[PDB]
Amino acid sequence: MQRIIVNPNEPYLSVIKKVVKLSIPIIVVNLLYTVENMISMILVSSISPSAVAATGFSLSLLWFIYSLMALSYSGTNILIAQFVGAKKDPSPILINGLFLSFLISLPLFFYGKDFVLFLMKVLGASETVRSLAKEYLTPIFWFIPIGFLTNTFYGAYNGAGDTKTPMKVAIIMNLTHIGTAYTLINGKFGLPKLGVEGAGWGIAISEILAFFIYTFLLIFFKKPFPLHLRLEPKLLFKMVRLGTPTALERAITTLSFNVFVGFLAKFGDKVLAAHQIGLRIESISFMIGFGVMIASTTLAGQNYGARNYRGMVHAVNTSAHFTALVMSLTGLILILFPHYLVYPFSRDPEVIEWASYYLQIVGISQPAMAYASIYSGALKGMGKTHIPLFVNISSFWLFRIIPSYFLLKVIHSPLVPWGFMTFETAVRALFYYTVFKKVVGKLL
Template sequence: MQRVLINPEAPKSENAKKIIKLAFPIIVVNLLYTVESMFSLVLVSGISASAVAAVGFSLSLLWFIYSLMALSYTGTSVLVAQKVGAGEDPSPVLSSGLLISFLIALPLTFFGKDLVLYLMSLLGASDRVVSLSSEYLTPIFWFITVGFMTNTFYGAFNGAGDTRTPMKVAVLMNVVNISTAYCLIYGKFGLPKLGVQGAGWGIVFSELLAFLIYLYLTRVLKKPFPLLFSVDKETLLKMVRIGTPTAVERAVTSLSFNVFVGFIAHFGDKVLAAHQVGLRIEGISFMVGFGFMVASTVIAGQNYGAKNLPGLIYGVRFTANLTAALMGILGLVLILFPKYLSLPFSRDPEVIRWAVYYLIIVGISQVPMAYAVIFSGALKGMGRTTIPMVVNIASFWLFRIIPSYLFLKFIHSPLVPWTFMTVEMFLRALLFYLAFKRELRRQSPSFSPQPD
């Protein structure tokens, strides 16, 4: 285990090193997941356009299903961080997280695929796409309990301050997924030719490998701490209390985001394509923010558990300013070079023109986004997951969706929702800052600061 306790008196370079050491592997992991998704689409592109549509649509809807992972992942990550910070045994937390993730995923083994296919049909997918999606999703849902438990292991390692090991595991997962999927899709090296289903088996084999590696590390090598299967009612209830708001938040946000994209879709395929291009380019900046958000959760959780309030405050604020500086630079790149960033994704002049507008507008929001995700992560680390749920959902609807809907009645332009997207991010950052300050005032009397 690695205790990441922050000493405000230590040199800034020392604290920066701790934070970057935590965040960098998480950024790499997210980049690898992005590469994995891209390769899934590339590999099935040799089958047909319908196969690409099926896998792409399935991946989008799987994110809605995977929002349930947040219940066990968040509870495990936060409570492990707090236990490590307090110098207590985090093994019961991981055991409880694995049990919860298994129980959540078990019904999905039998009903999950049908739910996804129903949503797909409801959203207008053709019979051919639904049929191919069924082939792709079948092995994934057969082994979805493994995927959920693997994600819980990932949360435990992050909470314990070991983000390098999951990065190495993610590299192996990518290699296994891509190579296995290629062989099974096209029947290479004497293996059966499974078509789209082969891509699903690629995901399954990569998750099985990761699960076995995590099990070996925790049970045999006792890294980052020994896993002793011990579950108690109090830990289970605390985990559900902490994890449920995040799971609800992700599910509602996923659906809300699709509502927002629906506004863009009304302006035609080229504007929608420009929006998708912009999202993928902006995603690089978001991955940086997400990596540091997880770092802020670990820092807040461990220092909260150690009752080191000065270190918690200093660590979160230092992380917020560092993230804002990095994302600010990336935002400036989006503003200054939007056309050159868009060209690799499309040669259509209209798509490029709208993508340029999107990137300039969204580039302005990178700094407030940095502060929003860091303070959100810090509140989760302190176990206050209900606050981020309320702020994120309320902010998305009150400042983004509803104003966009009303203004579009008078100004028919995609610039309207894009503008409110940036305005909303500034307001969300302010709300999170005020919520974090309020929580610090509430916690101050109960803390007795400890030295690093």
């Protein structure tokens, strides 16, 4: 596999061309997932509001336990990028990462469903909503090892620098997901109506199809890399070392976010609904920085593996400036046109005003988020996965949650947590920039 080297004095537009080629397929992958989940929500709402509640609770808890996938994703992803940059054969990384992903899926396969329903009992779901959720989750947990394996293929491609092939798989996966769920929920074309169980099968069947395509490309075209059947315990242990802080950051971020949202829950259903609407609107801004973050791990990792440290820094700094310009635009749009963006979601005047204030406050923070996304990705590509764990969790609690806790005792307004959200985002970018300079300085 050929590397994506960035030369220390490469012109700006030639670096961006490489960044955009990597980043656009990941942004597409992410936006297909957003569109699919929106369509899947409408399909389930054709059943009953208890069905919507069951899948709503299910998806949030599934998102939590999916933190585990970051372990096998990150270890495989980082090491393949570094090996490609060092001109080493990455085939051992691919096979051990897939086996590791399969292994860590097994506790979720054997007892993840009970754990989810257990953690659903807690949130105050009726036993009817939990009984529907158990039907929805049954096919999902039957094939959760397939989900782990396809997520690790995704990481192998991305680290290898071929983000287009997972985008191709994602297009087919997402049509299969929507077509299956639509067919099995409504019982279309002389097929039995399965209810929420049909929405679950849509996830399982699309994952099985993704896995078959990945495996077909592996056996017959040698994937990103040829298949070699040999486990290497030293690589398994290195992948665990790399991926464990990433899995932990995702799990702890979700818990921290639950705490923070509770601050808005105390303002009533309308402030809470506006926060959610503002979040899903803000996440089209999110996916851009998230895709270039993926791309930053590939670029940083490959150039780090090549010991091309000056070119690695050049790639990261150029990427960061470019993504901060793009998100200056998306942020400007959030500040200027919030009533247009909110309009498709609700018509409650009072909800429109809160969500619009949310979008405006956070739109200021979009360029900072771009900086945090890219420096985080660059540190992961260097193998420093414990650094985004420390930066993200310490920033979240010290500059967002705890200041909100104390000032909300004096100022009873949702603008308080929302204002600290944008303050913390700016602080966290400065934090990442500071640590990145010191890390790169020792490297140079």
